[PDB]
Structures are given as C-alpha cells and as structure tokens.
Design a protein. Structure first.
Lengths: 168, 168
C-alpha cells in the first residue's frame, strides 16, 4: 500500500522517533513492504518512517540504479530498524540532496564521507556495515529524519539551495 | 505587462544589483508599471526587480489590505529606487515571510522592528521614511533581494520552515 508522504511543515517530521520493538512480526513486514512501495512510487533512494507519519526508528533505502544520481554506485536495498551511526573519520564531503517531504528542491549538504551504521533487518537479524560516499550520505539523511531533522538546517552555502529544474 | 518571476536556484537572484540611473524616464515608468502588475497577479506585498531578472536596485510594495497577512496595517503603495536602509534600534521581531521566488513555503524570520529607508520614487522625488513592524519587514525583505540574499539564509529556527498549507 502506497502511503502519503507528509511535507515539511508537519510537526510529525520534527519528532524524535522511538525504537522498533516488533522485529520479525507480520505488522512490521507489512509496514516495510509499504515503505519500499511508497519509496518506489515517489522515486526515492531512501525513505524514513516519519515521512509517512509513523513514529518509529525505521528506514528503507537502496537502488540498482538512480536516474537522479546517475554516477552513484548501487546501494543495497535495505530495511533498517533502530539505526545507530558512527562517523569513521572527520572528513566531510559536499553533495546534492533533495527530500520527498520537500518536493522540487535540493541543496548541497556536507556529510561524513565514511560511517558505520548498525541496527536490525525487519526479521531481526543484526546489520552492521561500514559505508562511504553516497551510501553513507543516504543513511545520514534518513537517520536525521528519525531525530526530527531535515536537510535545510544543514545547508552552509545558501547559493546552492534552489529548485531542481532551475539549479545551475 | 506581467513578467515571469524567477525561482530560487536561479543565479540572477544571487547578484548584487547596480543603481538605477534613469529616474523620471518612460522606460523606468514602464518597468515599474510592470512590477506593480506582476506583484498584483502573484498576490505579493512586495517585489524586487531581480525577481523578474532585471538587475537593478528597485522594488515595489504595499497594499490597502492583505489576505495573507490580515492583521497587517496598510502599507503605502511604493516604488523605490536605490534603497538604503538603516536600523533605528537593535530590537528584532520574528514574523512569517514567504517569497514568490519560493512558492508554497514560509518561515519565521527575525527582522529589525524599526528602520529608516531612503531612495527615490520613479519620477526622481526623494523618499525617506521611518518604518516599523510589517512595513519595515517588507522593505528589509525586498532590500535583501537587491544584494543577492533570500530569507532561508536568515532562518534561525528551522522548525518554522515549511509548506503553507501544512504549517501548524
Ligand atoms: C541523497 S540523500 C537523499 C535521500 C532521500 N530520502 C529521504 O528521506 C531521497 O530519496 N531524496 C530524493 C528525492 C533526491 O535526493 O532527489
Ligand atoms: C512579509 S515579507 C515578504 C515580501 C514578499 N515579496 C518578496 O520579494 C512577498 O510578497 N511574499 C508573499 C509571497 C508572502 O509573504 O506570502
Ligand atoms: Na526538530
Ligand atoms: Na529535488
Ligand atoms: Na548571494
Ligand atoms: Na508562502
């Protein structure tokens, strides 16, 4: 079932989401199914549960290939609960992001180039991976959603903030 | 003639505009006529020349009444060239702004509560006024456009940044 994506301005995107506690459940599998479906219909590369007004530490992401980010390597399709994230150096990297809760826009956002993330797959198997570049960025971006944070609060150069069809 | 309003992302909104040097001219009157017309069609309370891709220190503003800002007192309809602005105290005030170059959005922006602004009417008569509250805010907002600045770079609380129909 495709869910409605709530847009910036909605208080529900500003919450700190509680943990998932129903790993391996039919309810959770259904929710993640919906998230993948919803992410697909909106052409996202990630999607965070709060974006569909469900207050939980849960995200999905990945693609074989992206139209939006053609140079991006494949990122494994992943559903991740109770994510925690750790930078593996201080090195930052700028890159383009946009948000489905902020349709039509993008900006350049600095993110850690290298991270580790940990959590659980929906069946309850533990996940821990090191990630870099775009893979890392995506997970940081989704992580932010889980703590009530959106990319505009991280823009440093506002000359890069603009509409997709316009930006130059 | 209604002009196209360029949207955030366009480099032309990021320029520092040169002075108007054709006060009292038919060309300038025509340009301001267009600006008032354009501002009217888009339901603005101000509009800055760079928003219609004309690189000049020129702005129009004012209304008898605003649907968008019903509590706002009338601000005199004004066309102002070569504006300069001076705060009259350090007191700041938060209020809602939106931008026609950023359709659909608004945020809370701190502005000087009290200013003086100076410049010329299109016929070349000098204008100097003291202004407060909403009158002041509008002129600051348009002034920003003339130096390559947009309101997102002044947002301090990003919880207030959001879509019009959503914000709560
Ligand atoms: C590259 S980081 C952006 C990840 C998000 N998911 C957000 O919750 C997107 O898929 N964004 C799309 C819309 C994009 O960047 O164009
Ligand atoms: C109240 S300050 C906003 C002034 C601008 N003019 C900008 O160049 C507007 O008229 N904004 C409208 C769209 C609004 O605030 O809703
Ligand atoms: Na928040
Ligand atoms: Na975008
Ligand atoms: Na600028
Ligand atoms: Na608005």
């Amino acid at each position: 079932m495709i869910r409605d994506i709530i847009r910036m301005g909605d208080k529900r995107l500003l919450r700190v989401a509680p943990q998932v506690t129903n790993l391996g459940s039919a309810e959770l599998h259904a929710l993640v199914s919906d998230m993948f479906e919803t992410m697909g219909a909106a052409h996202g590369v990630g999607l965070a549960a709060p974006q569909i007004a469900v207050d939980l530490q849960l995200m999905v992401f990945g693609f074989e290939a992206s139209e939006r980010y053609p140079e991006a390597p494949a990122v494994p399709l992943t559903a991740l609960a109770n994510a925690q994230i750790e930078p593996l150096s201080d090195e930052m990297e700028n890159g383009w992001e946009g948000c489905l809760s902020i349709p039509g826009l993008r900006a350049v956002i600095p993110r850690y180039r290298y991270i580790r993330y940990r959590g659980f797959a929906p069946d309850g198997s533990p996940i821990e991976r090191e990630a870099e570049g775009f893979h890392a960025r995506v997970v940081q971006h989704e992580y932010d959603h889980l703590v009530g944070r959106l990319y505009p609060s991280r823009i440093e150069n506002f000359d890069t903030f603009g509409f997709d069809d316009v930006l130059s």
